[PDB]
Paper text:
PALS1 regulates cell polarity through binding to the PDZ-binding domain (PBM) of CRB3 with loss of PALS1 leading to disruption of cell polarity including loss of integrity of tight and adherens junctions. Importantly, the SARS-CoV-1 E protein’s PDZ-binding motif13 sequence allows interaction with the host cell polarity signalling protein PALS1 (Protein associated with Lin7/MPP5) thus interfering with epithelial function and integrity, a property of the SARS-CoV-1 E protein which is thought to be important for its virulence. As previously shown the PALS1 PDZ domains adopts a compact globular fold comprising five to six β‐strands and two α‐helices that form a β‐sandwich structure. Examination of both the PALS1 PDZ:SARS-CoV-1_E and PALS1 PDZ:SARS-CoV-2_E complexes showed that the E protein PBM peptides are bound in the canonical ligand-binding groove formed by the β2 strand and helix α2.
To understand the structural basis of the PALS1 PDZ and SARS-CoV-1/2 E PBM interaction, we determined the crystal structures of PALS1 PDZ bound to the SARS-CoV-1_E (SRVPDLLV) and SARS-CoV-2_E (EGVPDLLV) PBM peptides to resolutions of 1.74 and 1.9 Å, respectively. PALS1 PDZ:SARS-CoV-1_E and PALS1 PDZ:SARS-CoV-2_E superimposed with one another yielded an overall root‐mean‐square deviation (RMSD) of 0.72 Å. In addition, two hydrogen bonds are formed by Val271PALS PDZ –Leu74SARS-CoV-1_E located at the second β‐sheet of PALS1 PDZ. Lastly, an ionic interaction is found between Arg272PALS1 PDZ –Asp73SARS-CoV-1_E, and SARS-CoV-2_E Val75, Leu74 and Leu 73 are involved in hydrophobic interactions. Major differences are found among the hydrophobic contacts, with the rotamer of SARS-CoV-1_E Leu73 differing from SARS-CoV-2_E Leu74. Furthermore, in SARS-CoV-1_E only Val75, Leu74 and Leu 73 are involved in hydrophobic contacts, whereas in SARS-CoV-2_E Pro72, Val71 are also involved in hydrophobic contacts. A comparison of our structures with apo-PALS1 PDZ reveals that similarly, both SARS-CoV-1_E and SARS-CoV-2_E binding to PALS1 PDZ trigger rotation of PALS1 Phe318 out of the ligand-binding groove to allow binding of SARS-CoV-1/2_E PBM. Our ITC measurements revealed that whilst PALS1 PDZ did not bind to MERS-CoV_E, it bound to SARS-CoV-1_E with an affinity of 29.6 μM, and SARS-CoV-2_E with an affinity of 22.8 μM.
Author numbering:
A (entry chain G): 208 to 211
B (entry chain B): 250 to 335
The structure:
Amino acid sequence: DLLV
Amino acid sequence: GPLGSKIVRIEKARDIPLGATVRNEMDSVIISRIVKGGAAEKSGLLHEGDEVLEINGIEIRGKDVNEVFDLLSDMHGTLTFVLIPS
């Protein structure tokens, strides 16, 4: 998934 | 709170990740992982399964995680996260  | 949400204050530093990964689930943004050794683990404030409803007064439902990343890349300081715990 996308790291923030 | 609304939809059973809670208000959490999250520190954001330019060029430093919060330390959580997010995914889209239907029309929601859900936290999928709390990265070991990252800032989110250290603070204890974000958790897997949390749904992000708002970030500093901006409604997040319906937004692509890419837009969430872009939004956060344009913000710094103490941010107000409205979350639904899982």
